Design an enzyme around this catalytic site. Structure first.
Site, PDB file in Angstrom:
ATOM      1  CB  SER A 244     -33.407  21.247  19.104  1.00 13.96           C
ATOM      2  OG  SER A 244     -34.164  20.691  18.047  1.00 13.96           O
ATOM      3  CE1 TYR A 247     -30.543  26.386  13.467  1.00 13.04           C
ATOM      4  CE2 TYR A 247     -30.840  24.158  14.311  1.00 13.04           C
ATOM      5  CZ  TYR A 247     -30.450  25.014  13.297  1.00 13.04           C
ATOM      6  OH  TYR A 247     -29.966  24.499  12.120  1.00 13.04           O
ATOM      7  CD  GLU A 328     -32.823  20.086   8.853  1.00 13.25           C
ATOM      8  OE1 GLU A 328     -33.190  20.968   8.047  1.00 13.25           O
ATOM      9  OE2 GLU A 328     -31.637  19.948   9.215  1.00 13.25           O
TER      10      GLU A 328
HETATM   11  O1  LIG Z   1     -39.127  25.652  11.822  1.00 12.35           O
HETATM   12  C1  LIG Z   1     -38.450  26.775  11.475  1.00 12.35           C
HETATM   13  N1  LIG Z   1     -38.812  28.026  11.724  1.00 12.35           N
HETATM   14  C2  LIG Z   1     -40.075  28.382  12.373  1.00 12.35           C
HETATM   15  C3  LIG Z   1     -41.228  28.232  11.389  1.00 12.35           C
HETATM   16  C4  LIG Z   1     -41.573  29.660  11.125  1.00 12.35           C
HETATM   17  N2  LIG Z   1     -41.378  30.211  12.471  1.00 12.35           N
HETATM   18  C5  LIG Z   1     -41.449  31.694  12.398  1.00 12.35           C
HETATM   19  C6  LIG Z   1     -42.889  32.109  12.383  1.00 12.35           C
HETATM   20  C7  LIG Z   1     -43.335  32.960  11.199  1.00 12.35           C
HETATM   21  C8  LIG Z   1     -43.159  33.594  12.567  1.00 12.35           C
HETATM   22  C9  LIG Z   1     -40.004  29.862  12.770  1.00 12.35           C
HETATM   23  C10 LIG Z   1     -37.186  26.648  10.936  1.00 12.35           C
HETATM   24  C11 LIG Z   1     -36.158  26.419  11.841  1.00 12.35           C
HETATM   25  C12 LIG Z   1     -34.838  26.281  11.403  1.00 12.35           C
HETATM   26  C13 LIG Z   1     -33.782  26.059  12.252  1.00 12.35           C
HETATM   27  N3  LIG Z   1     -34.124  25.174  13.430  1.00 12.35           N
HETATM   28  C14 LIG Z   1     -34.519  25.739  14.603  1.00 12.35           C
HETATM   29  O2  LIG Z   1     -34.631  27.078  14.741  1.00 12.35           O
HETATM   30  N4  LIG Z   1     -34.825  24.996  15.676  1.00 12.35           N
HETATM   31  C15 LIG Z   1     -34.740  23.664  15.636  1.00 12.35           C
HETATM   32  O3  LIG Z   1     -35.043  22.916  16.725  1.00 12.35           O
HETATM   33  C16 LIG Z   1     -34.338  23.012  14.465  1.00 12.35           C
HETATM   34  C17 LIG Z   1     -34.252  21.613  14.405  1.00 12.35           C
HETATM   35  C18 LIG Z   1     -33.853  20.980  13.230  1.00 12.35           C
HETATM   36  C19 LIG Z   1     -33.535  21.750  12.119  1.00 12.35           C
HETATM   37  C20 LIG Z   1     -33.620  23.137  12.166  1.00 12.35           C
HETATM   38  C21 LIG Z   1     -34.027  23.807  13.340  1.00 12.35           C
HETATM   39  C22 LIG Z   1     -34.577  26.421  10.035  1.00 12.35           C
HETATM   40  C23 LIG Z   1     -35.610  26.667   9.128  1.00 12.35           C
HETATM   41  C24 LIG Z   1     -36.922  26.797   9.573  1.00 12.35           C
HETATM   42  F1  LIG Z   1     -37.923  27.036   8.681  1.00 12.35           F
END
Ligand SMILES: O=C(N[C@@H]1CCN(CC2CC2)C1)c1cc(Cn2c(=O)[nH]c(=O)c3ccccc32)ccc1F
Length: 351
Positions: A244, A247, A328
């Site tokens: 996390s 990111y 994940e």
């Molecule tokens: O949860 C995600 N994105 C959020 C959901 C939509 N959010 C944007 C809103 C529409 C405005 C961003 C998300 C994050 C990631 C990447 N990511 C991340 O950005 N942060 C994490 O902590 C994480 C942990 C495990 C796996 C991926 C992670 C990839 C794909 C996704 F859909």
């Protein structure tokens, strides 16, 4: 002005997340032209429109040449101006392009929310602007005491779940905040007693936290391409802090980051090894688990206010041919997330 009687850490949190220059800095990192698309000129419908063109690009890539792709690629750059001068910009012709721009648009939606709060509302010179901006988040933010039990557990969760492959930095916990968004406990009520509730990490760049604290963690809108995200349009979490923490997109030029700890109601998990671009789960399933090659030790789980905290050190999961090095967790209903803590992290880059 009155000078603000909030704790100094909470004041510095509010400064960081409402920082206009950080919002501009985030946009140019995704190659956006600030002259043609400045921060004030952002809007939901234009981000949504660009999402829809990206969904059209998604469709063309899946069914196969550069001839037809050129028109779809150019439509995208028309809606969201990019920094290429007198250009001929790079062609959006593969899954990586769709994923990369899907990430950009996610950030622009959250950046728009932060800026709309900032330029919306009232303006009063007698109040400290730190207090005014605090109230706009609709979130009670308290500093957690360093001698407390929950602070020790949180520090141990950070300490034990930093992955070996993310060792180019380590993490100092600067501040630990207890957070409570207005009405989220009410929204979470149907899932509060569900099985497999876990305290999990969510990292994001600091420029998205005004949106996250005001709106909660949201799902990408209908217009967004489901193929832009590995397990489709949901809210993604990890049990490894460093996964996390990556990111946050910190660097030597910007080494302070923010990360969430949320109670996520996982329930019956749909366990997957590779990409599956879905909008809805199969009947009976409450979440997706991306199966990591490495997992926190199940025998070292500890309870924090009724919720499991997978803070064991990383061991082999015994899962063979998987895409993912670490676990994940994805939910597809915003009501399954109750945000509990926010950590301010200092990244010490050894490289
Ligand atoms: O949860 C995600 N994105 C959020 C959901 C939509 N959010 C944007 C809103 C529409 C405005 C961003 C998300 C994050 C990631 C990447 N990511 C991340 O950005 N942060 C994490 O902590 C994480 C942990 C495990 C796996 C991926 C992670 C990839 C794909 C996704 F859909």
């Amino acid at each position: 002005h009155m000078k603000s009687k909030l704790p100094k850490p909470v004041q510095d949190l509010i400064k960081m997340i409402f920082d206009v220059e950080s919002m501009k800095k985030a946009m140019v990192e995704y190659e956006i032209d600030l002259q043609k698309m400045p921060l004030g000129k952002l809007s939901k419908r234009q981000i949504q429109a660009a999402y829809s063109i990206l969904s059209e690009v998604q469709q063309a890539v899946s069914q196969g040449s550069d001839s037809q792709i050129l028109d779809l690629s150019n439509r995208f750059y028309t809606l969201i101006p990019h920094d290429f001068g007198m250009k001929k910009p790079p062609l959006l012709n593969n899954a990586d392009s769709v994923q990369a721009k899907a990430e950009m648009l996610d950030n622009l939606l959250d950046i728009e929310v932060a800026y709309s709060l900032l330029r919306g509302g009232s303006d009063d010179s007698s109040k400290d602007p730190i207090d005014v901006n605090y109230e706009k988040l609709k979130t009670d933010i308290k500093v957690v005491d360093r001698d407390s039990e929950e602070a020790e557990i949180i520090r141990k969760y950070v300490k034990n779940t930093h992955a070996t492959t993310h060792n180019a930095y380590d993490l100092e916990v600067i501040d630990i905040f207890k957070i409570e968004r207005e009405g989220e406990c009410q929204r979470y009520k149907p899932f509060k007693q569900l099985h497999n509730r876990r305290l999990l990490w969510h990292g994001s760049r600091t420029t998205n936290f005004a949106g996250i604290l005001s709106q909660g963690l949201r799902i990408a809108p209908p217009e967004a391409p489901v193929t832009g995200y590995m397990f489709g349009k949901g809210i993604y979490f990890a049990d490894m802090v460093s996964k996390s923490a990556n990111y946050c997109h910190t660097s030597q030029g910007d080494p302070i980051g923010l990360i969430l700890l949320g109670e996520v109601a996982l329930g019956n998990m749909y366990e997957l090894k590779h990409a599956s671009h879905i909008s809805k789960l199969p009947k009976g399933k409450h979440s997706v688990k991306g199966l990591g090659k490495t997992t926190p030790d199940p025998s070292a789980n500890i309870s924090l206010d009724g919720v499991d905290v997978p803070l064991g050190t990383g061991i082999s999961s015994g899962v063979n041919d998987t895409s993912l090095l670490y676990n994940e967790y994805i939910v597809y209903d915003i009501a399954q997330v109750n945000l509990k803590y926010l950590l301010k992290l200092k990244f010490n880059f050894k490289t």
